[PDB]
């Protein structure tokens, strides 16, 4: 067609009891860069080669609902070195609410749990959130 | 490698007609030389008079650039003939021929001194040429030729 | 009259033997030093003068030559040495050293400066560490010795 | 004439399927300076001449549509130090859609691709970017 | 995809005679190049030495639009044949003419430079065909043709 | 009289096809502070002696018109550690379109020169920058 | 001819002894170093000839080779290692060492580089430092002499 | 086959000695060194044979023990010590020192590694410098000379 994707249609799998979420941020692929040149090259800028390659971190906010503790028991199913790993799924959905983009997420350990803040005159929900580390991610388009 | 001998040797006197010859037709010769083995002498081709063609190495750089040229501008075919494609295929030649200049195979001490490339309506191409699907494009390149004679002079300094 | 100094990465080094002045990898190198001379004396001292002693020339001292590579899997040079090290069998070479620049009157390629460096053979070789976690590249460098070197004048 | 030229009409010619981006962004060419300065120069600042050139990387931004995964593939196309590279064309048109300012970069590969940000209140389409390494650039302009 | 190889070797000499040739009955061939694999070299049809129909993309392009026009146009039958239909069908017309234009199907830098429909009484129809039942329409539309041949001119630049 | 100049008319030579520019900066002169104290002074803080000069670089911005490629042309003249120089003179004209303040520029030659960005939304025009170094300026006023 | 140069971050170590060529865990380290090669010499001075000294070739040396893992709580080659230093028992081995690459004619993991290690055997073993406060790995380390090293060509 | 390595900061010291085995402060430490053994050879050349020289086996070489903690102001143990230093009697001991993890099959604290040290008697005692303007923590040091140590196999 000629008409582009929204971001306000999703799903996250992630082995919990609830697959929805508020925000969901660092799906990114990175790779290093090496230079090099000899001395009598008739060219004075140096010449790049790939390197190794580099995975950002993953954060993602939900909001506090009664009798749901499901980041804290993840986070703190740690032992000295050894954790429970997951696979995690995130997906992008059309109308039909079916999947349209698909990232996908090997061994994922949670790092960071942070909880709400307390205002007497807030008027705003209380917001939790998890920063998540993997090895490699995966695109899917089609 | 893995050679003892030519059947024949061949002096300075009888190649003077062998390298040189009003007809033009070179011929090269195989010749051993004292504590080196058999070495080729000679790189010139049967048209040895041209002044463009003497040489054998200026013809198989050209036919090595001519063909690199084809199979990089072949996936153009059967594109619309407007002014974009005319770009796409001009960018594609200087990119292949600056890289040749970095290697040392062409002349100059900048990419600008080495070639040019040009395309272009009432440049190469004429309107009735667009008409029927012909795109004409003019290159130009500057290369070197070797030397073949070292001449030494000698004299008796003063003490 | 001067006003502006020569610029120092624009460089090249040639080998004036086996055959090797003739290859093109042969001549592309990272870095180079070690083109120095040093003169050697001793101290005299001399009953009665106090304000200073004589300083008498001895012998001529050069430092050692170091070539640096990215690796080349298949070297000739590399033979070379290793002929010398591994048999105990030494050939030595003459070698140019030559800074460039660039001569217009359009423009070309031109040598500027140009030493002569006689009898160089191999002293050392080596190859640099390799790291699981690092991004880098495989370096080689190569020292050798020699006699003395001069200007080509 | 007497009048200049806008930015809201161009090309870009990469190797993919579509040549439409939404922003196009690092075109610039810089060199190094070096000083000096002898004992007895009646001036008491440096002097300075010409050195090394450097070329910044290429960011480029595009809507996200059904069916197009283009720069990752591209991206995964590495190997351990090798990577198909690219001729990247960028133009400059008028307003009879012929070509007016070109530049032209060599051997192009991409170093850093970003996916989308999801939020569910969030009225906006999804923008992907990538980041491109390259040896040198040119300017034609006529 | 998924092929090994053409069981017949097709030179440029044979294919002089393939592509061009009095009768007008082109043959396209499969031919293999180096590094590339099987490739489909030619796009004309049976009609090849006919000023408006020699290729095959303009074909399939008249017969995507007149078949997609006839659909959009079908919900019109059986109504009253007056003024008003008449507009409501060359709007529907004009709309889609301007959809494809945008897509970049359509030559020209404006859509009334691409293409142009009509309809009226005596421009038109004569009042024998309205009365009957009948309604015509004029449409007229601009298209773009492919390049072919790309030539190169190779020379020698002074030093 | 009583009242000031303002700084919308003026004009730049500079060896170029055209003269107007739309922003000009980096107009300043400074020099170096010593600080010296003896033991016995009776006074503790130290004393101030002048030192060595530094002049800033110059910048200047213009709109992009069709057939003119001066910057990129005179950037590119570079040579290993050459390349053409030039003298700089920018004035302040008054109503009658004459001078009446002048900066005088020895030896300036470009180090850098930055490409447009490109928008499909914007409505504004497409400006380049060049950035000149230069040895020593001067200032004449009357 | 070359245009770009050897990564050195993809590597291996291949011990062609008892029967340790075979286990998985005895070819992963982290660091590997030590391949080095170095010509000794005297100098001579000729009386009469001032202008450079002579240079005479004595002796080869090798550096010694280390290697970096974490730490294996059951290893056959640390048995082999404390066996030749507790009990004054050695039995030298052959080494490999190889540098990788990927080639593609649809790609495989090929050897770029081959040096042949012989006569090795055990020099010096260490383990980290146990710090109460810091976030870090026990790692193991262990030092090697050989007789000398080879390209295999 | 292993995929994560052992970590470095959960560990303990047994004293295998006069009654110092069941006393709780005296296993818990800051900061323990020292582990590593290396073997001293010397070099003999052979003539006639240019390529490599002999390098032969002398004597074994181990390093001192060090631990770290912060003060205790009534130890036995340093009692131990004293008695050594001040009135030149010493009695060595024996000593465990212990790499632990967590094992489950719920979970527990087990050894991982555990070295046995043979014959250690104090060598070296002190204390941190006293300064009125920082922020630390008194410290003392103790080091230990033994004979050897051994993998509990």
Chains 1, 4, 6 share one sequence.
């Not at chain 1, 007497?120 to 998540?132: F, K, M, P, Q, T």
């Not at chain 2, 010749?31 to 790189?43: E, H, P, Q, S, V």
């Not at chain 2, 667009?130 to 390149?141: A, F, Q, T």
């Not at chain 3, 050069?62 to 070539?67: E, F, N, R, S």
Request: proline fraction near 4%.
């Amino acid at each position: 067609a000629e008409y582009p994707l929204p971001k306000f249609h999703f799903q996250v799998d992630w082995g919990g009891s609830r697959l929805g979420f508020t925000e969901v941020s660092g799906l990114d692929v990175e790779t290093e860069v090496i230079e090099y040149r000899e001395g009598n090259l008739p060219q004075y800028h140096k010449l790049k080669m790939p390197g190794m390659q580099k995975f950002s971190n993953i954060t993602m906010k939900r909001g506090t609902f009664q009798g749901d503790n499901d980041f804290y028991k993840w986070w703190n199913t740690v032992a000295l070195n050894t954790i429970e790993r997951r696979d995690l799924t995130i997906s992008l959905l059309n109308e039909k609410h079916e999947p349209v983009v698909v990232w996908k997420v090997n061994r994922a350990w949670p790092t960071k749990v942070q909880s709400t803040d307390l205002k007497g005159d807030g008027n705003e929900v209380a917001i939790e959130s998890i920063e998540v580390a993997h090895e490699g991610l995966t695109i899917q388009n089609g | 490698s893995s050679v003892i001998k030519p059947v024949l040797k061949i002096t300075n006197e009888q190649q003077n007609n062998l390298n040189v010859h009003p007809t033009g037709k070179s011929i090269n010769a195989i010749r051993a030389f004292t504590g080196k083995g058999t070495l080729i002498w000679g790189a010139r081709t049967l048209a040895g008079n041209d002044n463009e063609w003497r040489y054998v190495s200026v013809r198989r750089f050209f036919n090595m650039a001519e063909e690199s040229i084809k199979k990089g501008s072949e996936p153009f075919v059967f594109e619309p003939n407007d002014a974009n494609t005319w770009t796409k295929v001009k960018a594609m030649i200087e990119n292949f021929l600056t890289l040749q200049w970095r290697a040392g195979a062409l002349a100059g001490a900048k990419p600008e001194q080495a070639f040019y490339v040009k395309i272009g309506l009432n440049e190469t191409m004429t309107a009735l040429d667009i008409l029927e699907g012909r795109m004409i494009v003019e290159i130009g390149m500057a290369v070197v030729r070797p030397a073949e004679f070292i001449i030494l002079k000698f004299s008796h300094k003063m003490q | 009259i001067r006003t502006y100094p020569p610029v120092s990465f624009f460089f090249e080094v040639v080998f004036q033997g086996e055959n090797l002045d003739k290859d093109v990898v042969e001549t592309r190198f990272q870095s180079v030093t070690g083109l120095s001379v040093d003169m050697q004396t001793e101290t005299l001292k001399e009953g009665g003068e106090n304000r200073f002693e004589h300083i008498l020339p001895v012998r001529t001292k050069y430092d050692p030559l170091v070539l640096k590579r990215g690796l080349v899997n298949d070297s000739q040079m590399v033979k070379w040495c290793m002929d010398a090290i591994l048999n105990f069998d030494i050939r030595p070479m003459n070698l140019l050293v030559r800074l460039l620049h660039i001569e217009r009157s359009s423009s070309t390629i031109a040598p500027l400066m140009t030493w002569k460096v006689i009898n160089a053979w191999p002293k050392k070789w080596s190859v640099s560490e390799f790291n699981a976690e690092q991004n880098s590249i495989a370096v080689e460098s190569l020292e050798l010795n020699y006699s003395y070197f001069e200007t080509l004048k």
